[PDB]
Ligand binder design. Sequence first.
Ligand SMILES: Cn1ncc(C(N)=O)c1C(=O)Nc1ccc2[nH]c(-c3cccc(Cl)c3)nc2c1
Ligand SMILES: [Mg+2]
Ligand SMILES: [Zn+2]
Length: 316
Amino acid sequence: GLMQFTLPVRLCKEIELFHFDIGPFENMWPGIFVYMVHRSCGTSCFELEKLCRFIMSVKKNYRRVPYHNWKHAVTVAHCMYAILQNNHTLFTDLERKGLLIACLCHDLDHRGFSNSYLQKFDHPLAALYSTSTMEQHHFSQTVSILQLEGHNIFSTLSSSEYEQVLEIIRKAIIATDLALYFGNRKQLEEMYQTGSLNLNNQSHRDRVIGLMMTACDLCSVTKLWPVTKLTANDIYAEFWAEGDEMKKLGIQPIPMMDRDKKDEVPQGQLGFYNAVAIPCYTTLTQILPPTEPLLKACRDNLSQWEKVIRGEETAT
Ligand SMILES: Cn1ncc(C(N)=O)c1C(=O)Nc1ccc2[nH]c(-c3cccc(Cl)c3)nc2c1
Ligand SMILES: [Mg+2]
Ligand SMILES: [Zn+2]
């Protein structure tokens, strides 16, 4: 275990920032992920050769879609790294291990379509899994990959530790279904405001980890403006392809998925920062005060979208 992963000077500094962008060199992202695992977990959490084989099989089962791709997996994992490193006294050995892996695996085999498009299309995944359809598919892909030869990165855990870390990963992946976020955040807001929240309660921990997953999964809204604006182009590239598919079934798409409604994107973003993102990072900051820079960069990008609405800025 005398093989440390090292990063160039600028990446070693800036990867500690919540707003870090992992860059356009795909062949560096496995190295970045391993480095974050060695520092947040430890060099002996996993055998390097199995982790590397795992990472490359995971990469292989992400698709060449505009947004829900391999670069999103690593980006979401980096946001979990920042949260873990700035809160290191609060999490267990098994939570460190499981959570970066859950983030890497959390959108495995995404085709760029929502749970609603699978219901309206009558995709077979919708018969198998009636709610959190894609998310139950992503967990199931995670299990397939763990069961490939030489891919059990959790080989040294007991039977009952292996079962807990898989349950951490299952719950974390299910939580990235944004339809569940609204309930989970309501519950955590009441629990914090009445002072009933208890990190020794497993059902409370599950809720906090879920919100952590929502925060990590939306983290595009918490990058510097040019990253935030450029990533919104890839998100809408997918939404509009899905709305096209909705039209082919003879169904009117909701406005965010209609490419004809392109000029209303700035007002849509504002709707989404006020109804989803700001509440998300506000609640997470109350629970984990050191996650502050996420909410701060969210508020900053809200102003940016407001400048776009008043013509002081453009977005093509
Ligand atoms: C930035 N980011 N990061 C993660 C996600 C995510 N997974 O949702 C998003 C995101 O952009 N979501 C989003 C949600 C609701 C929207 N509603 C409109 C919208 C409404 C009315 C007219 C128009 Cl034209 C458009 N746009 C939306 C975008
Ligand atoms: Mg997802
Ligand atoms: Zn995601």
